[PDB]
Design a protein around this nucleic acid. Structure first.
Lengths: 206, 100, 127, 98, 113, 150
RNA sequence: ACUAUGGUUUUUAUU
RNA sequence: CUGCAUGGCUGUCGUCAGCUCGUGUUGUGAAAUGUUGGGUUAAGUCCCGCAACGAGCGCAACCCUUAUCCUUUGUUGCCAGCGGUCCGGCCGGGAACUCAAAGGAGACUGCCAGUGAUAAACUGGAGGAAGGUGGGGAUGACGUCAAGUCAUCAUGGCCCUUACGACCAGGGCUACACACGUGCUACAAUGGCGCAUACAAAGAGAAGCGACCUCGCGAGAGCAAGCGGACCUCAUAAAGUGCGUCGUAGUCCGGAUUGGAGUCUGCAACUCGACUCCAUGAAGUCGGAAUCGCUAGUAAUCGUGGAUCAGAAUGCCACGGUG
């Protein structure tokens, strides 16, 4: 059996957490639930915003979010009023006044979340996944990768077959902690299953 | 987990804003032992034996993402079967896999 | 002139002080002859003091806290040694040859998961 | 004269936060009282890897927590105003009560 | 043998010498002595020194043997034909405080072959 | 099959002048109870006080000269057959075997108390008869019924 | 190295 | 309902050394050569060699912890010097030291001697706090068992929906035609009990831990300090030692069974709860064919916490003592 998330396993390399907030243990379940309340709404509303990562931060009676997108022009607009709307509604579920920081992605087709979008959206469009995946792999090795694996799972092309398919390029370490692999997992669902995808990107050792 | 269960759990948070003012004091009044074979609540006892979700029993924290009845841990504020997802997503501050 | 030595064993710690000129043998304000009156480790504190002949030439003071009594004794042997090897640098090599100057490595192990009694494994005979 | 209670989940964070508080405190007080390190707090956990099966398999996790106090020895209150006009390292909690 | 009552032990501790004969409890077996100035130490085997020949009526003036049995059977005096829980569980040799009969039941019926 | 180790060297006691006291307190020792070991150590020399001889400083170590180990039996399997061989005791371990045989009756006999069991058995020391002697006497049978080994 | 010795384990699913 | 229809998620051999790609050679090919052999290793590890030359993944290391010296420093932990001063880390203070935190250094088979292929490496030696894998822990390649989960989530099919729903008053899941596994205590004298007393670690603690003090044979209840963390409380750790005492007695032991009387939670405890105090009391004197765990602070074996939670664990996890 396969085990442990290929990036979540590396948090032990003294990495920071996806939200930083302080509260005494008797209110910890609700202070954590407030964190899910914002992360689940922001990810649901950024599902088609070309976003690669989201980080939350919750200072004392405050919330400060940092989101990375390849296309900030579909998150900001109207002299900043179209994001002033997003600021209004996140404060409505956070219960605190908000700040919203939008970072712009360069080389987005080298980032595991946006490389995964490039195949997940085309798998929903019933595109020939072996071609679409081969291009996504070679394009990553063109743009800045040193090794990559993209791996598809279940109902391959709607057929009565499970297994996995990938075709790996370059080098991708498995158990070397200086390797810093960029990772993502997605689902395309359609009407006949879940139709999953996984991706591992290697850029060089730390 | 049942939709009629969370309905009761949500109404229990609004109960905390209407019951602990005076009805929790009426529950103390009808639980008193000091008087014997004399009436003082004869018409209002059925007006206090009806409320029941105000009992300390029959409560569990439950999972706020799966409604799971058991598996809670006060140190995490999270149901045990959802910790391994959160700890890989980085969603709990200070938590790390180490061994020692 | 006062001399000092640290000593450690099984998470316990000893602070030992030595002075020239005959006198006391103190441990937590008590006598070193009497604090280890029956203790199985009662010679462990003596081995380095015998090597100069005790209670005839120097003065000894000890403070110890926490853990076991055989622990505190084995910590004291290093604490005495660390002061005595500066009080007599002609003994510094004698204490290396006796091994009393090396750090105690007998640290306690911790309970394993799937096991109940430290590292005794729960038994299994058949399927 | 006041302590500035600084809390974090990381040592190099709580120190690089301290590094601008002691720099502010020199801009608003000429000198500082210097370090207070504290014993670092740590908790361990043994978590089940299976939802219902395999009772003898538990994985070993930590939560480590950091605290600092700074301690201000100038009674001039010029640092406790500037502390609330300061860009500080991210992921910490700061409190003051005279 | 059989000097303190119906039970056979030869040499027995004086503060429990009246146990296992149906008439005295563990604390009563020591209290019965101090009301008569009788020694609470050294094991006894014979009717010497007044140590137990002084205790014959002080035991018998209370519920003993079948009279003790009849008193601890007051629990079922309204259940001597009505079988409701305790009734049937006493009209036959049966448990009344729960029994995990699938183990630990030899003691209820007789020893294993 | 590849872990290689040795033996821990031990010093004679400053009072008793012998290396026996440095090891024998770890023999018959159980549950970490070394103060019970330091409380039964040669305690039979009081139940043997009329049969002790001169100098109680050596009056237990002299018994090893009558425990007199000569051979130890090893039993191993080669192919399907288990075999047994009596081999002569080794130059330091001969003393360890005497130290093991001297406590064979210390609990496993009806005399009651360790000291009385041990004094009775230290008085069967010359002939070695009846109970608690099997491991001392029946090992010798194999070395007198066969003197042609390889 | 060679104990003196023993017969027998329902069926089926990566297309 | 179907995880032998699935995504996701998690075991096991094993942390075993193994799984592959490019190129050159071989064979019709499957495939081999490589990756086998030799010396060596913890090891496809490190040396050597030969039609094989190199590379990728696993393996060593990077993650976690701890052991030492050197230097500077510190809270509510510490107390060598110094001021105050009954003398008290108490006040002032110090950061010497236990400890704590940071800064720096240290280990490399580097050095000696054999062995061996003048290699790698082992064993021994020297120096060192540490030595050959420093001690003790994450980490699971490519495979096997179609392992397990439709019982988290998601989902194709199948089924119930004038229901098997879930609202409410309530059952059963602690029912035994018979044995084993697990946990555990006694049969003890190398013991047990009472009384005294030596030496603790770790952790939890705002409808909590609850002190002093009071009441209640006691469980528990009341007055009520402090604490949200090195504050104040759970809480004087028990084995160990010392005196007394037992002395094969089916035992002061050990209490299945069991009756009463109190305590506590709850809308409600009898069944199938916990705690306490009385009175009543069987077995157990040694164990069949057989079986299990540890290589060192380990096996032994007694103490102390944590989670869950209205109320109740002997199961789960965690830390000391002797050894």
């Amino acid at each position: 059996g396969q085990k442990v998330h290929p990036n979540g396993i590396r948090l032990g390399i003294v990495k920071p957490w996806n939200s930083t907030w302080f509260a005494n243990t008797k209110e910890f379940a609700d202070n954590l639930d407030s964190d899910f309340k914002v992360r689940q709404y922001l990810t649901k509303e950024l599902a088609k915003a070309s976003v690669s990562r989201i980080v939350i931060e919750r200072p004392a009676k405050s919330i400060r979010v940092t989101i990375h997108t390849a296309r900030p022009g579909i998150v900001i607009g109207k002299k900043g009023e179209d994001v002033e709307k997003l600021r209004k509604v996140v404060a409505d579920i956070a219960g605190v006044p908000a700040q919203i920081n939008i970072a712009e992605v360069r080389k987005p087709e080298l980032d595991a979340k946006l490389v995964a979008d490039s195949i997940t959206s085309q798998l929903e469009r019933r595109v020939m996944f072996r071609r679409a995946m081969k291009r996504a792999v070679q394009n990553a090795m063109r743009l800045g990768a040193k090794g990559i694996k993209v791996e598809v799972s279940g109902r391959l092309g709607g057929a009565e077959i499970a297994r996995t398919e990938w075709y790996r390029e370059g080098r991708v370490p498995l158990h070397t902690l200086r390797a810093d692999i960029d990772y993502n997992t997605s689902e395309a669902h359609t009407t006949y299953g879940v139709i999953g995808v996984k991706v591992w990107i290697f850029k060089g050792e730390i | 987990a049942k939709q009629s269960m969370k309905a009761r759990e949500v109404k229990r948070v609004a109960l905390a804003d209407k019951y602990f003012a005076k009805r929790a004091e009426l529950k103390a009044i009808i639980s008193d032992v000091n008087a014997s074979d004399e009436d003082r609540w004869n018409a209002v006892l059925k007006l206090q034996t009806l409320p029941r979700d105000s009992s300390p029993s029959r409560q569990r924290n439950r999972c706020r993402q799966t409604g799971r009845p058991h598996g809670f841990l006060r140190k995490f504020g999270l149901s045990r079967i959802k910790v391994r997802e959160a700890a890989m997503r980085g969603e709990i501050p200070g938590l790390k896999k180490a061994s020692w | 002139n006062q001399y000092y030595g640290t000593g450690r064993r099984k998470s316990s710690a000893a602070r030992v002080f030595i002075k020239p000129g005959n006198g006391k043998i103190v441990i937590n304000q008590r006598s070193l002859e009497q604090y280890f009156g029956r203790e199985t480790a009662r010679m462990v504190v003596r081995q380095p003091l015998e090597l100069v002949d005790m209670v005839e030439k120097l003065d000894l003071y000890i403070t110890v806290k926490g853990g076991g009594i055989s622990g505190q004794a084995g910590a004291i042997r290093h604490g005495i040694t660390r002061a005595l090897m500066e009080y007599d640098e002609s003994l510094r090599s004698e204490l290396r040859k006796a091994g009393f100057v090396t750090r105690d490595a007998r640290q306690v192990e911790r309970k394993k998961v799937g096991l109940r009694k430290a590292r005794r494994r729960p038994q299994f005979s058949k399927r | 004269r006041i302590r500035i209670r600084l809390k974090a989940f990381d040592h190099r964070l709580i120190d690089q936060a301290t590094a601008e508080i002691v720099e502010t405190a020199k801009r608003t007080g000429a000198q500082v009282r210097g370090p207070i390190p504290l014993p670092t707090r740590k908790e361990r956990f043994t978590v089940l890897i299976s939802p219902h099966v395999n009772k003898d398999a538990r994985d070993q996790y930590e939560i480590r927590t950091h605290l600092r106090l700074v301690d201000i020895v100038e009674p001039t209150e010029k640092t406790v105003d500037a502390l609330m006009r300061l860009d500080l390292a991210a992921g910490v909690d700061v409190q003051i009560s005279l | 043998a059989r000097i303190a009552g119906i039970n056979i032990p030869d040499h027995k501790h004086a503060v429990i010498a009246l146990t296992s004969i149906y008439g005295v409890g563990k604390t009563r077996s020591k209290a019965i002595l101090a009301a008569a100035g009788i020694a609470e130490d050294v094991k006894i085997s014979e009717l010497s020194e007044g140590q137990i020949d002084t205790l014959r009526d002080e035991v018998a003036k209370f519920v003993v043997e079948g009279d003790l049995r009849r008193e601890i059977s007051m629990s079922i005096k309204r259940l001597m034909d009505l079988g409701c829980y305790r009734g049937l569980r006493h009209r036959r040799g049966l448990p009344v405080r729960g029994q995990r009969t699938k183990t630990n039941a030899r003691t209820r019926k007789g020893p294993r072959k | 099959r590849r872990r290689v180790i040795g033996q821990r060297k031990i010093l004679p006691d400053p009072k008793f002048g012998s290396e026996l006291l440095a090891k024998f307190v770890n023999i018959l020792m159980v549950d970490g109870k070394k103060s019970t070991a330091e409380s039964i150590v040669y305690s039979a020399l009081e139940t043997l006080a009329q049969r002790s001889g001169k100098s109680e400083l050596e009056a237990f170590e002299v018994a090893l000269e009558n425990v007199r180990p000569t051979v130890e039996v090893k039993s191993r399997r080669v192919g399907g057959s288990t075999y047994q061989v009596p081999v002569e005791v080794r130059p330091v371990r001969r003393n360890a075997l005497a130290m093991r045989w001297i406590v064979e009756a210390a609990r496993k006999r009806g005399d009651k108390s360790m000291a009385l069991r041990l004094a009775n058995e230290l008085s069967d020391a010359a002939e070695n008869k009846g109970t608690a002697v099997k491991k001392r006497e029946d090992v010798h049978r194999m070395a007198e019924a066969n003197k042609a080994f390889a």
